[model samples]
Target chain A: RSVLLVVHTTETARRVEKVLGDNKIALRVLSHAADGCELVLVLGGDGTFLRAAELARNASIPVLGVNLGRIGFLAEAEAEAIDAVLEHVVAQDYRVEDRLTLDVVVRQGGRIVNRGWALNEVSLEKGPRLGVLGVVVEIDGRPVSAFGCDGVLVSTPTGSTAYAFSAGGPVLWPDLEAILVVPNNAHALFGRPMVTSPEATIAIEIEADGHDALVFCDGRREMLIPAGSRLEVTRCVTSVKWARLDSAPFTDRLVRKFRLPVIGWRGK
Target chain B: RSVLLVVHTTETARRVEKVLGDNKIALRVLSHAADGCELVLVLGGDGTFLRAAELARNASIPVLGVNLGRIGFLAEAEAEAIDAVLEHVVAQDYRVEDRLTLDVVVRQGGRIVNRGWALNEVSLEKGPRLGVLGVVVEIDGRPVSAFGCDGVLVSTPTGSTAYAFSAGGPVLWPDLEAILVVPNNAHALFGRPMVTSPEATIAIEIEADGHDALVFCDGRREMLIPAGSRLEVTRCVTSVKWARLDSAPFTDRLVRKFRLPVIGWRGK
Candidate 1:
């Protein structure tokens, strides 16, 4: 099998490349990682992981993220443990866990025009024009509410800690099979986050006379949603695989990354 | 079977009693509803429903709430439809839905000191001394995070739209069996709401030397937790039964109650 390396900068890429080369490991590929690679090694932050996830998802491979930037929810290892990570990678001694992902469809005039997937979230952000993103959220064919806000996020349970968390959504445990919907800066009083069953269908239909929306999947890929268009979200058939050297709880990762105040935790 | 009546004011109670009497329906009892009553009729808002639920829960009876108060989530009908509601009740033409509830145990010195249950939420609020409530949250024996805040809430799915929503937590659909934890006014970047399995054990332990906690269940019953006490939450064995005049979705109730802006919804 082969391994692909992804980094935020050429400088970091050169470092990881030299390290892998010095250890006689697999060579690093920069052209978005060759298909069918055994693993995608990410050397930057969560942003880098998102990029790697795109490549890894296409090949149905696992991604291993090392934290070099601040407070990443995707990194499985820190820079201090790169040596051990490299050793484990070389030995092929890592467990792969599947993360839930979301599949989104943009439909205009009763036709599916675009399809996208996200490891983090599929957000419908307000357009560049300084106007509200007017959207009506429909759950299971019932209109839940309409909001004029900055954006709306339909995310997977694995993504609860990412952009969804920043937009004031709940921190869904990764093991849970569910979808999280959060209205960002919504003007309505009922703009609360909602947790729905994985079997649920969610649609965000923009007001026909309102502003056009920028539909972003994990903030990397973009699709334009005209004012009259609609976006639908559901659990993807395929999940993103993550490589882990050890079994670590998402709780530990959460606390370590956020530096939460746990000074006097008297747990049993 | 018999029917018990609960109301906010004597005027409303009198009016409802007169209507029941004029219609030759079942007698209305005011003594907090008699045991084994057929239904506990609430004549006010959500607050009245809570009171009626307490009475109905003791006898394992169903409750039917007619909304006379503003913005209620529990009422199945409005005041304008009280006559029709009474007719349907007399005809026994309504559905009974079970709602999730939580049981809490307060322990001090390794012994259970108090037991409480809530159809809504159990909150551990800071006492009147004007000090931050220092507490640690443990999920299934793992310390999740510690917070200095006004209070902490552990609520059932049914409670998510109630106090949990007010405290900035996600809305858990009543059909989903889960627990919600929210830190109220927490002064931390990682103070996000959490959704956990219904089977997960949640423990909120007060800092041994911090402020004494005021434990509130559904904002009705109160228990005092000294600085060194801990409260444990779990799904209760018994659930509250709500009488529904129709099979209205929770989504409709939510929008109607909050007046969410959904005028332009184009649902299929």
Candidate 2:
């Protein structure tokens, strides 16, 4: 069987290759939309999982993440559990979970300039300028609010605990089907993050008179948007599939990662 | 037809009663669940709306709010349009809209001690003391996290813009049916606001070794709970109905209430 390995370092790649080679398994050490692979294996943290997700999602294959980095929220197995994870994978005793995704379209001069998708978030941030970036947000073709802020993030439930959480957005359960909008460092009284319907078409319009901005998809691909450009985001038809070796709850993972103080507890 | 008038002041009550008297419509000036009334009209701000919602919800009647106080997010009509609101009410030219509600149950020593409900939020905060409060949060009978903080807030979509907004929670659209839990100044890394499934049961456990706490419903009703007690929040089957005078969308109201700067705009 063929498997794609998206590693954080060459050492991890060599180690995984050595183990898989003994079992006569073919390995590919690339993430450039590895289409012929049966599965995509992440050898790092959340960053690597997101990177592999793009290629795996396009190929319609499930991805399994191994936590070798700090607080890997997206990782399903720890480094110490690699052997068990491999055993389950070889035995075909894993389950796949579907995650929500977003598709972003950029328009300038009434023409589509670029199209992108993200597993975490599509963040629109200002360039190396001092002044605030004027932005007006609209939901379903109707204007919601406008303000001057450092940036605006449109995220999915899986992304709520990432950059969106750091930007004062709520942490959404990964199973939720909704969209989140957060304005970063906005100097306004109504700068609270907003949660919208999953079927909503959210639009972000940049002020033509303001400085240029950068649009990032999953923090991997970047595109420079000029004056008077606009971005439209909607739920993508394709979803990211994750391979699960166990049925561990997100709460348990969250507690372990954050080291929450659950010392004194009494429950029914 | 008869109606209940929930006013912010005696003068506002008299003014509303005078106009209703001219139209031969009966008015009650109390908010103690006027059961026989066909509608409950609010003559104040967001605070008064919450007060009246409790009474109207129990009686299963519709509520119409007129903005007389500052920044009334729950109010439907402005002070300048009070006459129009009355005209619509008199002619029954309004539609009823369904909004979600919550029911809270307090348990101590495996015995139910108190029960309350809220339209905005059920906030449990530390009493008149200086020490920190120990709080453990659970969802669907599973432990989520524990932290030391001043309080915890469980709110509905309708309350997201109220106290939860000040505590760094996201602004949830009123049409969405979801529950939000936010820690109030918790001294921990995972003290971020969380959004959960509508069908999930959220629980907050107080440390028996800690100080006492006060639980409030929409900041109107209050109850004191000693240590070693747990509070549960779930979506109520009964929903509050609002009388709509026009088809003004929530986005329009949000923009107007916050005075968002949406000057230069171009859209499809």
Q: In terms of lDDT, which candidate is strongest?
A: 2
RMSD of each: 15.7, 16.4
Clashing residue pairs in candidate 1, if any? Answer: none
Q: TM-score of chain B, per candidate?
A: 0.91, 0.92
Model 2 lDDT at residue B135: 83
- When candidate 2 is compared with the true two-chain complex, its DockQ is 0.04
Q: Which lDDT tens digits does candidate 1 get at residues A1-268?
A: 4578877763556666677776676665663437856788888878778888899898998889888877676778778777788878877889888888889999999999889998888888777323357778999999998767767889988788765775677788877888999886575666789999988999999889876777888878888888888899998889899897674578888888777777898999
Q: Itemize residue pairs with steric clashes in candidate 2.
A: none
True contacts kept of each: 0.08, 0.08
- Once fitted onto the true fold, the runs of candidate 2 whose alpha carbons sit more than 4 angstroms away are A10-15, B1-268
Error of 2 at B58 (Å): 68
Candidate 1: which stretches are off by over 4 Å? A1-268, B10-25, B31-33
Model 2 Cα shift for residue B160 (angstroms): 25
